[PDB]
Structures are given as C-alpha cells and as structure tokens.
Design an enzyme around this catalytic site. Sequence first.
Site, PDB file in Angstrom:
ATOM      1  N   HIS A  41      29.370  22.656   4.776  1.00 24.81           N
ATOM      2  CA  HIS A  41      28.698  23.843   5.291  1.00 24.81           C
ATOM      3  C   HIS A  41      28.275  23.688   6.745  1.00 24.81           C
ATOM      4  CE1 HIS A  41      24.641  22.116   5.226  1.00 24.81           C
ATOM      5  NE2 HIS A  41      24.792  21.762   3.963  1.00 24.81           N
ATOM      6  N   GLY A 139      17.318  19.712   8.552  1.00 24.28           N
ATOM      7  CA  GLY A 139      18.009  18.672   9.289  1.00 24.28           C
ATOM      8  C   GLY A 139      18.422  17.478   8.457  1.00 24.28           C
ATOM      9  N   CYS A 141      20.336  17.424   5.646  1.00 29.22           N
ATOM     10  CA  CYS A 141      21.636  17.470   4.981  1.00 29.22           C
ATOM     11  C   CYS A 141      22.515  16.333   5.471  1.00 29.22           C
ATOM     12  CB  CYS A 141      22.344  18.809   5.224  1.00 29.22           C
ATOM     13  SG  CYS A 141      21.421  20.208   4.630  1.00 29.22           S
TER      14      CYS A 141
END
Length: 299
Positions: A41, A139, A141
Amino acid sequence: SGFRKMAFPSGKVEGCMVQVTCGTTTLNGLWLDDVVYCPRHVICTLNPNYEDLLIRKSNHNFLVQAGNVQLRVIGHSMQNCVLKLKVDTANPKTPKYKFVRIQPGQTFSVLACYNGSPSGVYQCAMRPNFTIKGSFLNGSCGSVGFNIDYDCVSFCYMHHMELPTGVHAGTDLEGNFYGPFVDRQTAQAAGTDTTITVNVLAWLYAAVINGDRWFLNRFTTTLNDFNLVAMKYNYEPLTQDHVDILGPLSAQTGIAVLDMCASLKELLQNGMNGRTILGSALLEDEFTPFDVVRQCSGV
Ligand SMILES: O=c1c(O)c(-c2ccc(O)c(O)c2)oc2cc(O)cc(O)c12
C-alpha cells in the site's frame, strides 16, 4: 527469578530496517541481501487494484534510504500484499534468516520503526482472531515481527494497518495476511477473541516456579470436564497435544497438567480475591510454554 515480557535482542533486525518513500508516503522496509520488502500500500493510489497501480510505477519512483546512504531500486515486483524492491546493494548486515508463518497463540518480538530507524522492541502474541495488540503510531507500517533461534532470525510478521478497535493486522513475509483482513479501505473489524488456554497454564507454571502458589489445590480435573468450563469463559479448548507440550513444566514443578487445570478452573469460577500472580491481577495468556522454559531455565 522474576518473570517479565521479554523480547528477543533486536540487533540483527535493526541492521535490516530502511526507509521507503514513494509518492507522499513514507514507511519502513526490510532489507535482506539485495531485496527490500515493504507493504504494497506504499504504491501511489476506492478499492485500488494493486497490479494495475504497480504497472504505472517506475524504479526511480521508489526512494530507499539505509541510514543516510541512498539505495537505488533496480527492479520491483509484487508478492501478494508486500512489494519487493530489488536494489543494487546486498545488505552487508543481512543475518541468517527465514520467513515463517506463525499460529494463533504463538509469540514474537516487534521492532517498532519510523522512517527506517528503530524506536522500540516489545513482545506480542498472535491473537486467536489473527490480530495483535501492538503499540503502533503513524509511520510504523513495515515494522517486522520476529523470533530468533540460535543465530537465525525467523521473520513472521510485517505490520500493515490498525483496525477500528485499536488492534493491529499484518502479513507474513510472503505477503499473506494473518486473518480475514485486506489492505484496502473497508469497514473490516476484528472478530471475537478468545483466551489462549495453553498459554495461561504455562504462565501458572512460571508463577509456581517463582514462588507464587496460593492458587494451587489438591483437586484434579479431566480434559473433557475442563474444556466445558473453558467454553463458558471464552477460553480455547485444551488438547492432548497441549498437555504433552506442558510436560516439561509439569515435570520441573511436579504438578500434573490436569492438576493445574483444576486450579485454573477455580480461578475462573471465583476471582483471585485481591491476590496477584506474577505481579498480575489478570490471567496472562501471551507467554507460550516455550517462552516460560526460556525465561525460567535457559535464555
Ligand atoms: O488503517 C486503515 C487505512 O489506513 C485505510 C486507508 C485506505 C486507503 C487509503 O488511501 C488510505 O489513506 C487509508 O483503510 C483501512 C480499511 C480498513 O477496513 C481498516 C483499516 O484499519 C484501514
């Protein structure tokens, strides 16, 4: 003595964490040999088709930073829900590693990262509903979960997103989600959770090993009659395999598993009546039999 939520030493994983920037999105990647793994993503975007979106990307769109040295992406591919960025440098700090998928009830350490720089490490359990109750801000991920065996890092989790209830969902390192979750804006929610019975039992054993014994009793139940009270209090069924796995803890304390089950049954019917176990007023279910042996015998 003592019992704490102990993570694995994080140094081998710290040297793999990089920053991946593409579009206006910045997240974390895992750099092993000449490949950087990160959530897909990150791709520049209602219901994205990621195979389409990734076709519209060029290698120079992906900005990868290992500390301060910049890494140039020479190729890119999709692997389910993770993206694999081929880079022109193999990571000199690549540890011996493998990608493993874990089971609900098993535990791992989480290296929470932001902008490719590690910030903290903690112990997690895969909940029976395939979520984890982590600690994750924007932040984070691409932060990874892992176990260490001798000298080998077993990566088992990459963080992808937070669910409405505040718990977390991610993939294994082949890109396959834990549980019925997807990396697109849905109203998806965590399903009902249950308590990991075998873990509670192992933690009861850890307590006995540490001098906490006030919950013990002389009574002993059978498997079948214990699984019936378990069901009532939303506890996973306990199986004969679980009893065998508890064997070493049984041996070292001299309390039979079905004896400890009778004590667990008592703690569910009555409370603790103001007493604690291992500094906890709740029954703790995020230590496996393996974690107890590790902390209460050899680390
Ligand atoms: O955490 C989530 C999230 O970030 C978003 C999202 C989706 C598309 C975007 O373009 C974007 O900026 C955010 O979707 C979600 C959908 C869920 O069902 C559950 C979530 O937890 C998230």
